[PDB]
């Protein structure tokens, strides 16, 4: 069995190996990469996402979100307070202001310590889930706006044509901006490219151990758990590495830097934080191996999680018994 300890693997494809996305995902899996829940892919040195980042300041962040925490330093929830629109140039200036800028630190480990000690005492502002892309149209390899769609994959594997589209999203971050513990919608893969700026630290639980995380989360967030059998789908709960280690939960950590891709695998719980001003692009995708995870994915039917249009068909075809309850939650 490849990668039995479920370590995060790092890949260095050549330019030739970078030509066929599906083939390279399947290669990484043949080496056991999925067992970690997360892999890093360093593009060949011949590759670039676009020519420069000099021309992005006029992108609008229509609904910046202030991430306000409740709880204790290692076990907290965050809610997202809506703020007034601002451009990427305005947001960058904000991120670099004295109130929000990254503190002096020694190394990634010292910054991680500072994040876990101090995150709850501040409310950083995140530009999330902005539809769009920063890949140049002439980038032909690993262009996240030109991947095969999930609707086409379901059609190829199962034979049924479905409505829906699959497009990328941009994330503009600053110090302490946080992504809570979650798997992807319908336990899909994701791919995330860090276009520019400061790093992003990730935490991940192996898919084979995902239920251990869920059980701890129900214990640590007991009112949220009563509210929703799939409350991690609300994407609000944070648990520190120290708390995970105290509770014997298997996990790994890694820091992504600008110019690097991360792939999350089906049912790989993940969480993390940004080091400073940055911009990432991410999209969900599927392979033949995903279908069995999609059929078994939990769902939030309480009203909170509220998702994309395109999830309807995935529930409807893969989970017909759950569909009527899930849809009632959407309305
Ligand atoms: O960068 C982010 O805010 C969040 N990362 C992810 O959840 C991802 O690509 O799946
Ligand atoms: Mg611009
Ligand atoms: Ni994610
Ligand atoms: Zn819910």
Coordinates of C-alpha atoms and ligand atoms in Angstrom, one line a residue:
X1 CA 0.0 0.0 0.0
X2 CA 1.6 3.3 -1.0
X3 CA 2.1 6.2 1.6
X4 CA 0.7 4.1 4.5
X5 CA 1.6 6.9 7.1
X6 CA -0.5 9.4 5.0
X7 CA 2.2 12.0 4.7
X8 CA 1.7 15.1 2.5
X9 CA 3.6 14.4 -0.7
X10 CA 5.3 17.1 -2.9
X11 CA 5.6 16.7 -6.7
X12 CA 7.9 18.2 -9.2
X13 CA 6.4 17.4 -12.7
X14 CA 8.4 18.1 -15.8
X15 CA 7.0 20.3 -18.6
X16 CA 6.0 17.1 -20.4
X17 CA 4.3 15.7 -17.4
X18 CA 2.4 19.0 -16.9
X19 CA 0.5 18.5 -20.2
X20 CA -2.2 16.2 -19.2
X21 CA -3.9 17.1 -15.9
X22 CA -6.0 14.0 -15.4
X23 CA -3.0 11.7 -16.1
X24 CA -0.8 13.5 -13.5
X25 CA -3.6 13.4 -10.8
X26 CA -3.9 9.7 -11.4
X27 CA -0.1 9.3 -11.2
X28 CA 0.0 11.1 -7.8
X29 CA -2.7 8.7 -6.6
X30 CA -0.7 5.7 -7.8
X31 CA 2.0 6.9 -5.4
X32 CA -0.5 7.2 -2.5
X33 CA -0.8 11.0 -2.5
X34 CA -4.5 11.0 -1.7
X35 CA -4.0 9.2 1.5
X36 CA -2.8 12.5 3.1
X37 CA -5.9 14.4 1.9
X38 CA -3.6 17.2 0.4
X39 CA -0.6 17.3 -2.0
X40 CA 1.7 20.1 -3.2
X41 CA 2.6 20.4 -6.8
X42 CA 5.6 22.7 -7.8
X43 CA 5.2 23.6 -11.5
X44 CA 8.1 23.2 -13.9
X45 CA 10.4 26.2 -14.1
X46 CA 9.3 26.7 -17.8
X47 CA 5.7 27.4 -16.7
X48 CA 3.9 30.6 -15.6
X49 CA 0.3 31.5 -14.7
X50 CA 0.4 34.9 -16.4
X51 CA 3.0 37.5 -17.4
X52 CA 2.7 39.9 -14.4
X53 CA 0.5 40.8 -11.4
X54 CA 1.0 44.5 -12.1
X55 CA -2.5 45.1 -13.4
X56 CA -4.9 43.6 -10.7
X57 CA -5.6 46.5 -8.4
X58 CA -8.9 47.4 -10.0
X59 CA -10.6 44.0 -9.4
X60 CA -13.5 44.6 -7.0
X61 CA -14.1 42.8 -3.8
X62 CA -17.9 43.4 -3.6
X63 CA -18.4 42.0 -0.1
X64 CA -15.3 41.8 2.0
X65 CA -15.9 39.7 5.1
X66 CA -14.6 40.5 8.7
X67 CA -13.9 37.2 10.4
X68 CA -15.0 37.6 14.0
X69 CA -14.1 34.8 16.5
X70 CA -15.9 33.4 19.5
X71 CA -14.5 30.8 21.9
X72 CA -11.0 30.0 23.2
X73 CA -7.7 30.3 21.4
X74 CA -7.5 26.6 20.3
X75 CA -11.3 26.0 19.9
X76 CA -13.3 28.7 18.3
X77 CA -15.9 29.6 15.7
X78 CA -15.9 32.5 13.3
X79 CA -18.7 34.5 11.8
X80 CA -18.4 36.6 8.7
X81 CA -19.5 40.3 9.0
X82 CA -20.2 41.9 5.7
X83 CA -18.2 45.1 4.9
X84 CA -18.4 47.8 2.2
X85 CA -16.9 47.1 -1.2
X86 CA -13.4 47.8 -2.0
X87 CA -10.9 47.3 -4.8
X88 CA -7.9 44.9 -4.6
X89 CA -5.7 48.0 -4.4
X90 CA -7.6 49.3 -1.4
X91 CA -7.6 45.9 0.2
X92 CA -3.8 45.5 -0.3
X93 CA -3.2 48.9 1.4
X94 CA -5.5 47.8 4.3
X95 CA -3.7 44.5 4.7
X96 CA -0.3 46.3 4.9
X97 CA -1.6 48.9 7.5
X98 CA -0.4 48.8 11.1
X99 CA -3.8 47.4 12.3
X100 CA -3.6 44.3 10.0
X101 CA 0.0 43.7 8.8
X102 CA 1.9 40.6 9.6
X103 CA 4.0 41.0 12.8
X104 CA 7.7 40.6 13.1
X105 CA 8.6 37.0 13.3
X106 CA 11.5 34.5 13.1
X107 CA 10.2 31.9 10.7
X108 CA 7.0 30.0 9.7
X109 CA 6.9 28.1 13.0
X110 CA 7.0 31.3 15.1
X111 CA 4.3 32.8 12.9
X112 CA 2.2 29.7 13.4
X113 CA 2.6 30.0 17.2
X114 CA 1.5 33.6 17.1
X115 CA -1.5 32.8 14.9
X116 CA -2.8 30.1 17.4
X117 CA -2.0 32.3 20.4
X118 CA -3.5 35.5 19.1
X119 CA -6.0 34.9 16.3
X120 CA -9.1 35.2 18.4
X121 CA -8.2 38.7 19.5
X122 CA -8.4 40.2 16.1
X123 CA -10.9 40.3 13.2
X124 CA -9.1 40.2 9.9
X125 CA -10.9 41.0 6.6
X126 CA -11.1 38.4 3.8
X127 CA -12.1 38.7 0.1
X128 CA -13.6 35.3 -0.6
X129 CA -15.4 33.4 -3.2
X130 CA -15.0 36.1 -5.9
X131 CA -15.9 34.5 -9.3
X132 CA -13.1 35.0 -11.7
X133 CA -9.6 34.0 -12.9
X134 CA -6.0 35.3 -13.1
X135 CA -4.7 32.7 -15.5
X136 CA -3.8 34.1 -18.9
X137 CA -5.9 32.6 -21.6
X138 CA -2.7 31.5 -23.3
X139 CA -1.5 29.4 -20.4
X140 CA -2.4 25.9 -21.6
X141 CA -1.2 23.7 -18.7
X142 CA -3.0 23.6 -15.4
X143 CA -5.1 26.6 -16.2
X144 CA -7.8 26.5 -13.5
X145 CA -10.4 28.1 -15.8
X146 CA -9.9 25.3 -18.5
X147 CA -10.2 22.2 -16.6
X148 CA -12.8 19.5 -17.5
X149 CA -16.1 20.3 -15.8
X150 CA -17.6 18.1 -13.0
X151 CA -20.8 18.0 -15.0
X152 CA -18.9 16.5 -17.9
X153 CA -17.2 14.0 -15.6
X154 CA -20.5 12.8 -14.1
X155 CA -21.9 12.4 -17.6
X156 CA -18.9 10.4 -18.8
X157 CA -19.0 8.1 -15.8
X158 CA -22.7 7.7 -15.2
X159 CA -24.3 8.5 -18.6
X160 CA -26.6 11.3 -17.6
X161 CA -26.3 14.9 -18.9
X162 CA -26.9 17.5 -16.2
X163 CA -27.3 21.3 -16.0
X164 CA -24.7 23.4 -14.3
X165 CA -21.4 25.0 -14.7
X166 CA -18.0 24.9 -12.9
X167 CA -15.9 28.1 -12.7
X168 CA -13.0 29.3 -10.5
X169 CA -12.9 31.7 -7.6
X170 CA -10.4 34.2 -6.3
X171 CA -9.4 34.7 -2.6
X172 CA -7.7 37.8 -1.4
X173 CA -6.2 37.3 2.1
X174 CA -4.3 39.1 4.8
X175 CA -2.6 38.1 8.1
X176 CA -4.8 35.9 10.2
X177 CA -7.5 35.3 7.6
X178 CA -8.8 31.8 8.2
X179 CA -10.4 28.9 6.4
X180 CA -12.3 26.7 8.8
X181 CA -12.3 22.9 9.0
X182 CA -14.2 21.5 6.0
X183 CA -14.3 19.1 3.1
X184 CA -15.4 20.3 -0.3
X185 CA -19.0 20.4 -1.4
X186 CA -20.1 16.8 -2.2
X187 CA -16.6 15.7 -1.1
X188 CA -15.1 16.9 -4.4
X189 CA -11.4 17.5 -5.1
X190 CA -10.1 21.1 -5.1
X191 CA -7.1 22.7 -6.7
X192 CA -5.7 25.9 -5.3
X193 CA -3.0 28.1 -6.9
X194 CA -1.3 30.8 -4.8
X195 CA -0.8 33.6 -7.4
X196 CA 1.1 36.1 -5.4
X197 CA 2.0 37.3 -2.0
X198 CA 2.5 35.8 1.4
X199 CA 2.2 32.1 2.2
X200 CA -0.8 30.0 3.3
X201 CA -0.5 27.3 6.0
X202 CA -2.6 24.2 5.7
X203 CA -3.7 21.5 8.1
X204 CA -5.3 18.3 6.8
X205 CA -6.8 15.0 8.2
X206 CA -6.3 11.8 6.1
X207 CA -9.6 10.8 4.4
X208 CA -9.5 7.4 6.0
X209 CA -9.6 9.2 9.4
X210 CA -12.1 11.9 8.7
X211 CA -14.8 10.5 11.0
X212 CA -12.3 10.9 14.0
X213 CA -12.2 14.6 13.2
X214 CA -16.1 14.7 13.0
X215 CA -16.4 13.0 16.4
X216 CA -14.1 15.5 18.0
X217 CA -15.9 18.4 16.4
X218 CA -19.2 17.2 17.8
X219 CA -17.7 17.1 21.3
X220 CA -16.1 20.5 21.0
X221 CA -19.0 22.3 19.4
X222 CA -21.9 20.7 21.1
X223 CA -24.7 23.2 20.4
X224 CA -23.6 23.5 16.7
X225 CA -23.7 19.7 16.4
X226 CA -27.2 19.5 17.8
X227 CA -28.3 22.1 15.2
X228 CA -27.0 20.2 12.2
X229 CA -25.7 16.6 11.7
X230 CA -23.2 18.1 9.1
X231 CA -22.3 21.4 10.7
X232 CA -18.8 21.4 9.5
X233 CA -20.4 22.2 6.1
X234 CA -21.1 25.6 7.6
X235 CA -17.4 26.3 7.5
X236 CA -17.1 28.1 10.8
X237 CA -15.2 25.8 13.3
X238 CA -11.5 26.0 14.1
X239 CA -9.5 23.5 16.2
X240 CA -5.7 24.1 16.7
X241 CA -3.0 21.6 16.1
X242 CA -2.3 21.4 19.8
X243 CA -5.9 20.4 20.5
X244 CA -5.9 17.9 17.7
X245 CA -2.7 16.3 19.1
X246 CA -4.2 16.2 22.6
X247 CA -7.1 14.3 21.2
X248 CA -5.0 11.9 19.2
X249 CA -6.4 13.1 15.8
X250 CA -4.1 12.1 12.9
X251 CA -3.2 15.2 10.8
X252 CA -0.4 16.9 8.9
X253 CA 0.6 20.5 8.1
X254 CA 2.4 22.2 5.2
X255 CA 3.0 25.8 4.1
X256 CA 2.2 26.8 0.4
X257 CA 4.1 29.6 -1.2
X258 CA 3.4 31.8 -4.2
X259 CA 3.8 29.9 -7.4
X260 CA 2.7 26.5 -5.9
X261 CA -0.4 24.4 -6.4
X262 CA -2.2 22.4 -3.6
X263 CA -4.7 19.6 -4.4
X264 CA -7.2 18.5 -1.8
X265 CA -8.6 15.0 -2.2
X266 CA -12.1 13.7 -1.7
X267 CA -13.1 13.7 2.0
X268 CA -9.8 15.3 3.1
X269 CA -10.7 17.7 5.9
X270 CA -8.6 20.9 5.8
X271 CA -8.2 24.3 7.5
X272 CA -5.6 27.0 7.5
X273 CA -4.6 30.7 7.5
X274 CA -2.8 33.3 5.5
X275 CA 0.5 34.9 6.5
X276 CA -0.1 38.3 5.0
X277 CA -1.5 39.9 1.8
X278 CA -2.0 37.2 -0.9
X279 CA -4.2 36.1 -3.7
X280 CA -5.2 32.5 -4.4
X281 CA -7.4 30.9 -7.1
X282 CA -9.3 27.7 -6.5
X283 CA -11.8 25.4 -8.2
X284 CA -13.5 22.1 -7.5
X285 CA -12.9 19.1 -9.9
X286 CA -13.7 15.4 -10.1
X287 CA -12.1 12.2 -11.4
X288 CA -13.6 8.7 -11.8
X289 CA -12.5 7.9 -8.2
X290 CA -14.6 10.8 -6.8
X291 CA -18.0 9.3 -7.8
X292 CA -18.1 6.9 -4.9
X293 CA -17.3 9.7 -2.4
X294 CA -20.0 11.9 -3.9
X295 CA -22.6 9.2 -3.4
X296 CA -21.7 9.0 0.4
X297 CA -21.1 12.7 1.1
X298 CA -22.9 14.2 4.1
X299 CA -25.2 17.0 3.6
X300 CA -26.3 20.1 5.6
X301 CA -30.2 20.3 5.4
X302 CA -30.6 22.9 8.4
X303 CA -30.5 26.0 6.1
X304 CA -27.1 27.3 7.0
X305 CA -24.6 26.0 4.4
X306 CA -26.5 27.4 1.3
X307 CA -24.5 26.4 -1.8
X308 CA -24.0 26.8 -5.6
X309 CA -26.7 26.1 -8.1
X310 CA -24.7 23.3 -9.6
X311 CA -24.9 21.1 -6.3
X312 CA -28.5 20.4 -7.0
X313 CA -27.9 18.0 -9.8
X314 CA -25.1 16.2 -7.9
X315 CA -27.5 15.5 -5.0
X316 CA -30.3 14.7 -7.3
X317 CA -28.4 12.0 -9.3
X318 CA -26.0 10.6 -6.8
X319 CA -28.2 10.9 -3.6
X320 CA -31.9 10.6 -4.7
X321 CA -33.1 9.5 -1.3
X322 CA -31.6 12.6 0.4
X323 CA -32.7 15.0 -2.3
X324 CA -36.1 16.1 -1.1
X325 CA -34.8 16.9 2.5
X326 CA -31.7 18.6 1.2
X327 CA -33.8 20.8 -1.2
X328 CA -36.2 21.8 1.6
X329 CA -33.0 23.1 3.4
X330 CA -32.1 25.1 0.4
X331 CA -35.5 26.9 0.4
Ligands
LIG1 O1 -7.4 29.5 0.3 C1 -8.6 29.3 0.9 O2 -9.2 30.3 1.6 C2 -9.2 28.0 1.2 N1 -8.6 26.8 0.7 C3 -9.4 25.8 0.4 O3 -10.4 25.5 1.0 C4 -9.3 25.0 -1.0 O4 -8.7 25.3 -2.1 O5 -10.0 23.9 -0.9
LIG2 MG1 -7.3 45.4 -12.2
LIG3 NI1 -11.5 23.8 0.7
LIG4 ZN1 -26.4 22.8 8.6

